[PDB]
Design a protein around this ligand. Structure first.
Ligand SMILES: Nc1nc2c(ncn2[C@@H]2O[C@H](COP(=O)(O)OP(=O)(O)O)[C@@H](O)[C@H]2O)c(=O)[nH]1
Ligand SMILES: Nc1nc2c(ncn2[C@@H]2O[C@H](COP(=O)(O)OP(=O)(O)O)[C@@H](O)[C@H]2O)c(=O)[nH]1
Ligand SMILES: *NCCOP(=O)(O)OC[C@H](O)CO
Ligand SMILES: *NCCOP(=O)(O)OC[C@H](O)CO
Ligand SMILES: *NCCOP(=O)(O)OC[C@H](O)CO
Lengths: 458, 450
């Protein structure tokens, strides 16, 4: 009955991700006591770990690898308004692959940050993953973020407010440059080990009056980490976004005219709009829309609809073109885009200049790997090398890409269905990525149909 | 209209890609200018047949590694269904995709070549046609259409005698496998020329039609397209017997013993007399609750708690399966045959390997008692009967025997209780689906005061 919410837990190594997640699983009662003792005993019989709470996240990472998920109810807990599943975490081989491919899709990210002397400054430095994980979460469109300032018991003095305020000020400034509004992000001081302020206020922090978030969708306030999880906003239906309609096919139909066919990915398409076709840059009014050969009054996201457009021939638009309205951020041609990729099994060496085909939404266009900007570690997202010379299997990377033919692609944080792509080479998928930013082409006003000229004159 | 998923199987080079592509051509699923763009791309790569075949060759290639970008090219429309091709043999991840259920076919189109040229006309005892049909039966694809292809190349052309020979030979095999041959339409086609795919072929006036006789009702037709419109919807989980794997068991004061779990099939009603397997306990359900609020019915998909009478918390655990005591009650598995694919891991697997099995909410070590067949994961063909070992990348038929009492189900009867993962320490070393289960010779045990 309650809505389902997926959580990913991020943060620098040894910041307390495992301890905090497992303690949350213990305290929220999704696992009975006998089952916990069975799994604590099994972890000890493996020799490894035997820390408290540790087996929970180590078991999750191991079961998020190649293969299936058989049951995930061990990492699902219930709050007052949400079923919440811990879907993934960094520190295992297929982490970045799951994030990029979207097999692990998160509605919110819990960023753990350690508060001990040295621990915080290490994760927030250039060598640390706090900023890298935050940027990765933003790159994937996880635009809800909870920051748990962990290990408050180990500050000097213990449970230090001065320390907590310092961490909030510096993390806020960094996530602000990344793209987050730090006024929407709750900062919860906690102790994953002892449990302080996870399910209820901690007697050890009477100075903490609570966190607050401001947002157009309604302000919220609370004290515990669990309260912060209840302020997660549901999956934003893309009806609010501008129109994006990648064309699947374009038919000519006797009597009617030209009718492209596609799934509406963002926004609404209703008859009478003055749409713009990228990357060809044509602009027309749509005469009608039809779904399942019956006419529709408006086409919300998800519908496979064909639509009748005026004065445009079939040789003028193709499968792979993107359709959006000219009233609300019309799609432009992509001049180049940077993206984050994961290199899949492929014995060869990818160098700069490697030109493969790029399946992106309904488009299918050869691109050039112009630069290899960064070499990323796939187990954690950690940056390994600036401007690498080549990439091999199992590597992740940031690359700039220039298409060899006109192409319309979007940033994945903005329009997800147009920002995830596959890299194919003959009958082999060699890489998959998500688009970081796309520098749009100069262009200008495209050729406007007689029908579109009449609409924009009343 | 209903959405329907199709898997296309058959021996290599029997004409799966040509038949499928020609069907997608003739059903207007793709515009003509896009068809030409991809036919020219296909000829440049030079790895597959230049016309028609690129459609299924593209699909095979894009069902790889775990990334799906767009499937619009493989969804065509018949008069009763939106049909989608999801997979076909001939790529590394075929068997893995079938088992892991990232491809869930409603019906299997089996393609058999009638024109065998100077090769072996016989459908061999250990051949790909039989092994593919055995695979579809293991994965619960209980609807099967046989396209007898390349009728243009028989001796003589469009030979009724050759067509009969093949139906007789194939019917015997699929009847042994477990299909009722009376329910399988046999359509003589030419995927290349388009004979008998959407309309009757003038080259086969002897073919008066195929006939199916099912428990639901008979149907007849001529073309392969009409065969696709006799596919039935799957059995909704609501109409199957109750199956409820227990996630947790709690002791609530006053209330008593409250198991919690997800209804996978059937309906859970307060007042039902359920049986817990494999502990063989039968008792009445006093109430059913969802979100600390009562419930008339617990439907498939609901995560519920239910209070049972006269049952101790020491008596039922996570991993036990709950079901109706009257309609198909669950029982303890004495042993079960399964189909697995081995993932990378150190060393080889012999008979006697006793790893942990992850099935529904259970977590129990099982013995690989017999390794029965070694299967290639690309083509799905049989490499070896009774192999001495399995290595990474292999696919196999194995007979498993649980070490502690376990309750599992055939994947075709109860899918959520029929697929499993195999773990060694923390590594995932195999995934599989259950063919058939030998239930324990144990009769009704503890029946409480209700
Ligand atoms: N004092 C203290 N130690 C903690 C706390 N949370 C975790 N630790 C410890 O810090 C280390 C970090 O371990 P872990 O939770 O596995 O970190 P991960 O690498 O981010 O998953 C372990 O030794 C934990 O026991 C905390 O709140 N307070
Ligand atoms: N003569 C004839 N050749 C066919 C027919 N269908 C397919 N072929 C050819 O048989 C070969 C194998 O077909 P393909 O579709 O690639 O087979 P698959 O390996 O099962 O996908 C190709 O050369 C096709 O052109 C048919 O009906 N008649
Ligand atoms: N990817 C090209 C490497 O050189 P860089 O300077 O970083 O890229 C800009 C191009 O040189 C433009 O001419
Ligand atoms: N408990 C019945 C209320 O739900 P409903 O949808 O009506 O289920 C009825 C059966 O599924 C009908 O077969
Ligand atoms: N799996 C080897 C054990 O001996 P085997 O003869 O193959 O199996 C015995 C049957 O299960 C009972 O007849």
């Amino acid at each position: 009955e309650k809505t389902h919410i997926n959580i990913v837990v991020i943060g620098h190594v040894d910041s307390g991700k495992s301890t905090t997640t497992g303690h949350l699983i213990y305290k929220c009662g999704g696992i009975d006591k006998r089952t916990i003792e069975k799994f604590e005993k099994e972890a000890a019989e493996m020799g490894k770990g035997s820390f408290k709470y540790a087996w929970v996240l180590d078991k999750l990472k191991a079961e998020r690898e190649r293969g299936i998920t058989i049951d995930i109810s061990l990492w699902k807990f219930e709050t007052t308004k949400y079923y919440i599943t811990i879907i993934d975490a960094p520190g295992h081989r297929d982490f970045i692959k799951n994030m990029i491919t979207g097999t692990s899709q998160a509605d919110c990210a819990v960023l753990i940050v350690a508060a001990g002397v040295g621990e915080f400054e290490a994760g927030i430095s250039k060598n640390g993953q706090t900023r890298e994980h935050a940027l990765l979460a933003y790159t994937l469109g996880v635009k809800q973020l909870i920051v748990g300032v962990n290990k408050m018991d180990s500050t000097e003095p213990a449970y230090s407010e001065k320390r907590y305020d310092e961490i909030v000020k510096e993390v806020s400034a960094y996530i602000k440059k990344i793209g987050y509004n730090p006024a929407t992000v709750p900062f919860v001081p906690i102790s994953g080990w002892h449990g302080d302020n996870m399910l209820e206020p901690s007697p050890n922090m009477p100075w903490f009056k609570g966190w607050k978030v401001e947002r157009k969708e309604g302000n919220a306030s609370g004290v515990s980490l669990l309260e912060a999880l209840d302020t997660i906003l549901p999956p934003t239906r893309p009806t609010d976004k501008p129109l994006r309609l990648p064309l699947q096919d374009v038919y000519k139909i006797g009597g009617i005219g030209t009718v492209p066919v596609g799934r509406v990915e963002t926004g609404i398409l209703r008859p009478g709009m003055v749409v713009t076709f990228a990357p060809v840059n044509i602009t027309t009014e749509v005469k009608s829309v039809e779904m399942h050969h019956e006419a529709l009054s408006e086409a919300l996201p998800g519908d496979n609809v064909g639509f009748n457009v005026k004065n445009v021939s079939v040789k003028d638009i193709r499968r792979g073109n993107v359709c959006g309205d000219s009233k609300s951020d019309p799609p432009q041609e992509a001049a180049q885009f940077t993206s984050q990729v994961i290199i899949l099994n492929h014995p060869g060496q990818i160098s700069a200049g490697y030109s493969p085909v790029i399946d992106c939404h309904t488009a299918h266009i050869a691109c050039k790997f112009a630069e290899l900007k960064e070499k990323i570690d796939r187990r954690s997202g950690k940056k390994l090398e600036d401007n690498p010379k080549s990439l091999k299997s199992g590597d992740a990377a940031i690359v700039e890409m220039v298409p060899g033919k006109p192409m319309c692609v979007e940033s994945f944080s903005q329009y997800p269905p147009l920002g995830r792509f596959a890299v194919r080479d003959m009958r082999q998928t060699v890489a998959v990525g998500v688009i970081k930013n796309v520098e749009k082409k100069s262009g200008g006003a495209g050729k406007v149909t007689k029908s579109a000229q009449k609409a924009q004159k009343a």
